Design a protein around this nucleic acid. Sequence first.
RNA 1: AGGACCGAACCGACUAAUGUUGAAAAAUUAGCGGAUGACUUGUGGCUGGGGGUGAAAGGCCAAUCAAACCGGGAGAUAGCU
RNA 2: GCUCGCCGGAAGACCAAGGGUUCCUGUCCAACGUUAAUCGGGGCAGGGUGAGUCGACCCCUAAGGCGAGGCCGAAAGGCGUAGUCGAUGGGAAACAGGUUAAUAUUCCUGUACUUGGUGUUACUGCGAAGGGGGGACGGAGAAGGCUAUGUUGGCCGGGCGACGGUUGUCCCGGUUUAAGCGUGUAGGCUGGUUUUCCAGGCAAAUCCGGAAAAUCAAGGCUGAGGCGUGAUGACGAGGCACUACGGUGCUGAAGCAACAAAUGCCCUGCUUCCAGGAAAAGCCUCUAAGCAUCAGGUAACAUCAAAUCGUACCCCAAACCGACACAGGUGGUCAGGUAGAGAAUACCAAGGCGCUUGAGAGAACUCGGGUGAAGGAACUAGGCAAAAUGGUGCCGUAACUUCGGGAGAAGGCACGCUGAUAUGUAGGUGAGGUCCCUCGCGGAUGGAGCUGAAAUCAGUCGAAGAUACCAGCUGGCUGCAACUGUUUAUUAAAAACACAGCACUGUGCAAACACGAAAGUGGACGUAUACGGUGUGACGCCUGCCCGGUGCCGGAAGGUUAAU
Lengths: 45, 94, 271, 23
Amino acid sequence: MKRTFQPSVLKRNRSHGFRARMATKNGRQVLARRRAKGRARLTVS
Amino acid sequence: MIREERLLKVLRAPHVSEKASTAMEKSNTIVLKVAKDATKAEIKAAVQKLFEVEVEVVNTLVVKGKVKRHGQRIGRRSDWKKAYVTLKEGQNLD
Amino acid sequence: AVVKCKPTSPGRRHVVKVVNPELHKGKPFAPLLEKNSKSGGRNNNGRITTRHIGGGHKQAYRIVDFKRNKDGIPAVVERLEYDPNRSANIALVLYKDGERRYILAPKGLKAGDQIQSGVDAAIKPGNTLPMRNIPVGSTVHNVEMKPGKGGQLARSAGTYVQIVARDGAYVTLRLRSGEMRKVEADCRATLGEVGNAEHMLRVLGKAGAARWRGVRPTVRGTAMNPVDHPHGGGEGRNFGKHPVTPWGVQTKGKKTRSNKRTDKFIVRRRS
Amino acid sequence: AAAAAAAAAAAAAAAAAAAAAAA
RNA sequence: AGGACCGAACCGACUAAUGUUGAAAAAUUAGCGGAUGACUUGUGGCUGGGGGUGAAAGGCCAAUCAAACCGGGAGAUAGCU
RNA sequence: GCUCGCCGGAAGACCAAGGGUUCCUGUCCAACGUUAAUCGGGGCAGGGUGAGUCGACCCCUAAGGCGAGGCCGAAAGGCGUAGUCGAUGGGAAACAGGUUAAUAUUCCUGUACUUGGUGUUACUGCGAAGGGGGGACGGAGAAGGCUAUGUUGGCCGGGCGACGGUUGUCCCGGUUUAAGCGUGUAGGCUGGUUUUCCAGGCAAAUCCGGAAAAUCAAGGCUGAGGCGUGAUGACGAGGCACUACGGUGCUGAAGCAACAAAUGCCCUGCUUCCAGGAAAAGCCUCUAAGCAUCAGGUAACAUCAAAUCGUACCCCAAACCGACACAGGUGGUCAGGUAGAGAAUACCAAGGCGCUUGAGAGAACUCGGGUGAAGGAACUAGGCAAAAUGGUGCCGUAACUUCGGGAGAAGGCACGCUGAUAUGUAGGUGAGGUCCCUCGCGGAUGGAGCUGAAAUCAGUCGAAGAUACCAGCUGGCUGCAACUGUUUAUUAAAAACACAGCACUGUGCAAACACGAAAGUGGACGUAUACGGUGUGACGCCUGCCCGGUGCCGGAAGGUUAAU
Ligand SMILES: [Mg+2]
Ligand SMILES: [Mg+2]
Ligand SMILES: [Mg+2]
Ligand SMILES: [Mg+2]
Ligand SMILES: [Mg+2]
Ligand SMILES: [Mg+2]
Ligand SMILES: [Mg+2]
Ligand SMILES: [Mg+2]
Ligand SMILES: [Mg+2]
Ligand SMILES: [Mg+2]
Ligand SMILES: [Mg+2]
Ligand SMILES: [Mg+2]
Ligand SMILES: [Mg+2]
Ligand SMILES: [Mg+2]
Ligand SMILES: [Mg+2]
Ligand SMILES: [Mg+2]
Ligand SMILES: [Mg+2]
Ligand SMILES: [Mg+2]
Ligand SMILES: [Mg+2]
Ligand SMILES: [Mg+2]
Ligand SMILES: [Mg+2]
Ligand SMILES: [Mg+2]
Ligand SMILES: [Mg+2]
Ligand SMILES: [Mg+2]
Ligand SMILES: [Mg+2]
Ligand SMILES: [Mg+2]
Ligand SMILES: [Mg+2]
Ligand SMILES: [Mg+2]
Ligand SMILES: [Mg+2]
Ligand SMILES: [Mg+2]
Ligand SMILES: [Mg+2]
Ligand SMILES: [Mg+2]
Ligand SMILES: [Mg+2]
Ligand SMILES: [Mg+2]
Ligand SMILES: [Mg+2]
Ligand SMILES: [Mg+2]
Ligand SMILES: [Mg+2]
Ligand SMILES: [Mg+2]
Ligand SMILES: [Mg+2]
Ligand SMILES: [Mg+2]
Ligand SMILES: [Mg+2]
Ligand SMILES: [Mg+2]
Ligand SMILES: [Mg+2]
Ligand SMILES: [Mg+2]
Ligand SMILES: [Mg+2]
Ligand SMILES: [Mg+2]
Ligand SMILES: [Mg+2]
Ligand SMILES: [Mg+2]
Ligand SMILES: [Mg+2]
Ligand SMILES: [Mg+2]
Ligand SMILES: [Mg+2]
Ligand SMILES: [Mg+2]
Ligand SMILES: [Mg+2]
Ligand SMILES: [Mg+2]
Ligand SMILES: [Mg+2]
Ligand SMILES: [Mg+2]
Ligand SMILES: [Mg+2]
Ligand SMILES: [Mg+2]
Ligand SMILES: [Mg+2]
Ligand SMILES: [Mg+2]
Ligand SMILES: [Mg+2]
Ligand SMILES: [Mg+2]
Ligand SMILES: [Mg+2]
Ligand SMILES: [Mg+2]
Ligand SMILES: [Mg+2]
Ligand SMILES: [Mg+2]
Ligand SMILES: [Mg+2]
Ligand SMILES: [Mg+2]
Ligand SMILES: [Mg+2]
Ligand SMILES: [Mg+2]
Ligand SMILES: [Mg+2]
Ligand SMILES: [Mg+2]
């Protein structure tokens, strides 16, 4: 059928990108939770 | 006027291929491998100043580097820039 | 008029149009249109606040002369146009100095009449003049209720108020809903019944005409579930509980007036 | 070289009931 | 002219057979309904969990919905196995 | 390499999204390929994407997002004005031909075009965060002109046939050419030109709008296609050749006409309907500020620039989404031949492939199918499934009915090929030629040539003429629901939901009501012929009795009654 991931990099970067995480208030705690976790890529962008 | 150390920093190599040799003989275009953040006017000024050769127009593209697997760990080769500098009508530059 | 559509099709069997040759086929006046984005029934929070709104044909909000500011200039009606927003037709009206406007169309108006606002005006339908100088017992529309705001009472298709009294500095209106109401007497009003008085004599014929007007389908209460409405659930058809709005307030016969500030302008309630 | 293409078997997804039940 | 007619694109999903540890965590084949409209679809936006949205089935909200998922309270509790 | 098969509105071509070197060469076959493999979309090394004109970047905005101040909020923050972002839309400009193993509207050849600076010549009212015009807009339909494109003839070149005949009314192949520039046609739209004035477009006006007056009823705007020109060129079937059999260079004729014709163009047009059909900048124009012949503007003319990024490849898939090289899913553009109404359907061309396990043997049994004696629903929960009916033209058609319907009711007839009417008819198209001609892409008789139904009569063939593929089963009684629609993605598509219509009720606009502590916003840029809520569910006939119960509405005289 039509599966549940139709990829589009505009919507991907616009909803899960670094600036769209950095804009809000519990988005900056998302990025500060991955830096303390020490991940490779923080977000998609 | 462009910075002389900048024009000395831009040109990195020539290019060595079958397309490069045929473009050197049939169209008088030298093929260079230039810096990553070069531009057309800076490359034209540098190729007129360093080699001292009259140059018509310059054609640049960005080669995408491959992704190799040395050993067992994957790795990215470094992208760069390639430039087809043509020369004037009837003018030799090796 | 009313032209019963000949029943060549089911759904066309019941339609009744309101045809009128006077409504100007053609273009509107470009300095007076706007953009009017369809709401969807959705406020700034994003939710559906009011329901059954969404879809329909795209409209362009005409700008109208609801305030009748240009006094003292005799203003001939250029043409009669079909406003999609409101119920009544509008009349593009050309003034003497040459600045056209849009006025909500009175009853017996046609392209050729003189409509003059102000205080000096004579008493013919269209001539806006204040209720200090309107003869009592008359009928008016486009009535302001605070002096200099824009008409707010009786501006539908064919509605009209009556000026039953004047004493002190208050006029007493019998509105279209049968309620009498004080209004301060410096407010302007416009003489005459309003135009499209066959607008109630239409029927929509089919559900597609409701969807063109821009209403969604309304799902009544007793065919829902008890999470989704008070009357929901029930094996079979069961409606044992008292009739209530979807947020728990009785509909059939419960007064819900709240503003105590304008209870002083209620001479008589509606009946 | 030595690729060693043996990743672990993550196989079980879900199930359902879908059976004629004695009741 | 029409929420008109018969019918391909396109949307569906009514019947049968085949598969059902399959080719496929809902499909193929042969027929079937709508097919100028309350149609369908591309692209971007919006509504967030007792909340959304609902032509209303307790349906849908990332193969999960009589109240999602991820972390935390948390080694909840369990007269039960 | 030779055959054979399959798709051919795709299983062909070009893309966007998406992926990210899979593209091409050389080498290896450990692993991967549902097998072998010298093969590969696998490993390894090397190569490969060239843009003033294509697209992003840019200028302009939509739904919307962030939103200096501000309002609001225990804190976090919510909303929102100036603004500033946001395309799927608006905005300048390039086509043809050739080459690479790999790019090409990017490279090369030919011919172009656009916007800006600078400077030189001539001339003088220039200037906006403003005013105005325009940009700038629906659905359906209908006709006309065309084009893409095909068919037929001619012309040029090749051929005289492995088997009867084949110098002909024969067979095969070609018969290509653009953008730009001029010419301004088929057409559509608009009355113009000039003078004076104005309660108007926040002031400003010569611009727009509005009035009055003179003159001419033809000036302007828009516009597919044609004809030149580009072109004397390129392209071209082919020959001539040097060999690494892979190739490679020079030459190279004809290169017209008629007809048919699109969903594409004129068309962002015209007719018509109501459900009344984006915004801002480009762009044209008026001026206030001011700047004062300084600057600037505009007709040229030369000269410089046009940056950066994507340009490989797949792109209905073996490379995206589905764990897989998975019979699944995925939006745009191009749409040839023969029958056909058709983009269905059958066979085909260009093109691309034969679905990454094969060889046997021809048991049960299972799947997809074909036919069947005699009977025809006896099968069965139930005509489920199959079988039949199918087309075009004509004849004909009932009960009932809301006058439309029923209805394609049912039911029946004709259907091929050949000859005649007519050596190809009616009709369509119109070359000549002749006359005017406000002289040109002008108009009338003129009908050559080209194409071309359809019908009647006769003959004849077959068992069967819509011969294949595609292509209604029909009728009678009745329940339920007025109908078209929508739903339980993935066991339920209905008698359920909606629906137009009916009624009750709330609401006088700072509405009722909802979302939000609150601002606010939806309601609504609407105003009782409107809006919310509730029940019912077209249309016809109708809606009868009860206010004891529980609600709701009206009373505030009395009993009981809180903080204070
Ligand atoms: Mg991740
Ligand atoms: Mg480039
Ligand atoms: Mg409602
Ligand atoms: Mg209703
Ligand atoms: Mg309903
Ligand atoms: Mg229910
Ligand atoms: Mg409840
Ligand atoms: Mg019951
Ligand atoms: Mg009971
Ligand atoms: Mg239909
Ligand atoms: Mg099917
Ligand atoms: Mg149909
Ligand atoms: Mg919850
Ligand atoms: Mg239930
Ligand atoms: Mg789910
Ligand atoms: Mg719970
Ligand atoms: Mg435990
Ligand atoms: Mg605890
Ligand atoms: Mg075939
Ligand atoms: Mg393809
Ligand atoms: Mg690789
Ligand atoms: Mg390859
Ligand atoms: Mg290879
Ligand atoms: Mg081996
Ligand atoms: Mg193998
Ligand atoms: Mg490889
Ligand atoms: Mg362009
Ligand atoms: Mg912008
Ligand atoms: Mg904004
Ligand atoms: Mg904000
Ligand atoms: Mg602040
Ligand atoms: Mg766009
Ligand atoms: Mg654009
Ligand atoms: Mg290629
Ligand atoms: Mg170039
Ligand atoms: Mg403007
Ligand atoms: Mg249209
Ligand atoms: Mg043609
Ligand atoms: Mg021929
Ligand atoms: Mg022979
Ligand atoms: Mg012979
Ligand atoms: Mg041309
Ligand atoms: Mg490409
Ligand atoms: Mg395969
Ligand atoms: Mg596949
Ligand atoms: Mg075809
Ligand atoms: Mg087909
Ligand atoms: Mg067998
Ligand atoms: Mg059979
Ligand atoms: Mg038998
Ligand atoms: Mg037999
Ligand atoms: Mg028999
Ligand atoms: Mg029987
Ligand atoms: Mg029986
Ligand atoms: Mg039996
Ligand atoms: Mg059947
Ligand atoms: Mg059958
Ligand atoms: Mg019964
Ligand atoms: Mg029904
Ligand atoms: Mg239906
Ligand atoms: Mg639906
Ligand atoms: Mg279901
Ligand atoms: Mg569905
Ligand atoms: Mg079903
Ligand atoms: Mg409000
Ligand atoms: Mg009901
Ligand atoms: Mg009923
Ligand atoms: Mg009753
Ligand atoms: Mg009672
Ligand atoms: Mg009582
Ligand atoms: Mg009673
Ligand atoms: Mg009471």
